[PDB]
Amino acid sequence: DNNRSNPESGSLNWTAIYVTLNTGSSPVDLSNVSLSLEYQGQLASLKYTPATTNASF
Amino acid sequence: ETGIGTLIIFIAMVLVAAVAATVLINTAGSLQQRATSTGSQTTNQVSTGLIVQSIYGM
Ligand SMILES: *[C@@H]1O[C@H](CO)[C@H](O)[C@H](O[C@@H]2O[C@H](CO)[C@@H](O[C@@H]3O[C@H](CS(=O)(=O)O)[C@H](O)[C@H](O[C@H]4O[C@H](CO[C@H]5O[C@H](CO)[C@@H](O)[C@H](O)[C@@H]5O)[C@@H](O)[C@H](O)[C@@H]4O)[C@H]3O[C@H]3O[C@H]([C@@H](O)CO)[C@H](O)[C@H](O)[C@H]3O)[C@H](O)[C@H]2O)[C@H]1O
Ligand SMILES: *[C@@H]1O[C@H](CO)[C@H](O)[C@H](O[C@@H]2O[C@H](CO)[C@@H](O[C@@H]3O[C@H](CS(=O)(=O)O)[C@H](O)[C@H](O[C@H]4O[C@H](CO)[C@@H](O)[C@H](O)[C@@H]4O)[C@H]3O[C@H]3O[C@H]([C@@H](O)CO)[C@H](O)[C@H](O)[C@H]3O)[C@H](O)[C@H]2O)[C@H]1O
Numbered sequence A: 001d002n003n004r005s006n007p008e009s010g011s012l013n014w015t016a017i018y019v020t021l022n023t024g025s026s027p028v029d030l031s032n033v034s035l036s037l038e039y040q041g042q043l044a045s046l047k048y049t050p051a052t053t054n055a056s057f
Numbered sequence B: 001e002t003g004i005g006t007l008i009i010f011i012a013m014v015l016v017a018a019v020a021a022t023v024l025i026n027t028a029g030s031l032q033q034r035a036t037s038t039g040s041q042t043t044n045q046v047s048t049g050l051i052v053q054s055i056y057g058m
């Protein structure tokens, strides 16, 4: 929640998702992974960009 | 005569049939090890677990 003083009138600013591989699976590169989300008539498509510096890692 | 030409193609026919035989054996051997390992890993996955008994504080 984005409000600490009163969380009742707040909204979600950050979301965390825990991800693992399935049992007996081949390795997966996360750079070729696309994430889809649907909320209130908005379809998002999120993508990770690999970099040496200034990377979200 | 036709006898000479028949023998030449015969050799080629035998060699081609051996190739297709090799593919089927090699593929089945590769799929054998994957299917065996998947079954054993899943059996361990379902059965295994941890349980909490009691929690104390100071
Ligand atoms: C998280 O959730 C909470 C709760 O849901 C809030 O929504 C919060 O948002 C923040 O809200 C505060 C308060 O509304 C905002 O700060 C305010 O900024 C204003 C600038 S603006 O006019 O340009 O918009 C004003 O400067 C505000 O001051 C006002 O309030 C003063 C006190 O009014 C009270 O008076 C009497 C008691 O004496 C009482 O009967 C009333 O009911 C009322 O509570 C007043 O003197 C000023 O003339 C002016 O109207 C300002 O709010 C400031 O005071 C509050 C708190 O005391 C009020 O009860 C609080 O500490 C603030 O920190 C403080 O700045 C802010 O912009 C929002 O972010 C969410 O983040
Ligand atoms: C989503 O909503 C959130 C509402 O809950 C919040 O608004 C998020 O924004 C974030 O706001 C917090 C402050 O509340 C910021 O966190 C603070 O960032 C500084 C970075 S700095 O460059 O300004 O120095 C720092 O990392 C602070 O950590 C200090 O405190 C911890 C724990 O005590 C300790 O490891 C170190 O002493 C460190 O310096 C951090 O503030 C946190 O700590 C305070 C107090 O304990 C300080 O005495 C509060 O508990 C606070 O809640 C903690 O966050 C973020 O920068 C900002 O993203 C929004 O995204």
Ligand SMILES: *[C@@H]1O[C@H](CO)[C@H](O)[C@H](O[C@@H]2O[C@H](CO)[C@@H](O[C@@H]3O[C@H](CS(=O)(=O)O)[C@H](O)[C@H](O[C@H]4O[C@H](CO)[C@@H](O)[C@H](O)[C@@H]4O)[C@H]3O[C@H]3O[C@H]([C@@H](O)CO)[C@H](O)[C@H](O)[C@H]3O)[C@H](O)[C@H]2O)[C@H]1O
Pocket (backbone or CB within 6 Å): A029, A031, A032
């Ligand atoms: C998604 O699936 C893919 C298969 O479909 C593949 O497996 C992807 O993995 C990627 O594989 C490629 C190899 O083709 C590799 O990318 C290359 O990385 C090196 C840099 S290194 O540090 O990793 O060693 C190489 O120099 C190339 O990087 C250049 O381009 C990028 C821009 O994207 C830039 O940031 C760099 O500075 C650098 O200039 C890159 O190879 C790509 O570029 C070449 C030529 O243009 C080079 O002149 C070809 O176009 C080639 O098709 C490109 O792949 C990585 O190892 C990996 O990401 C998987 O993500």
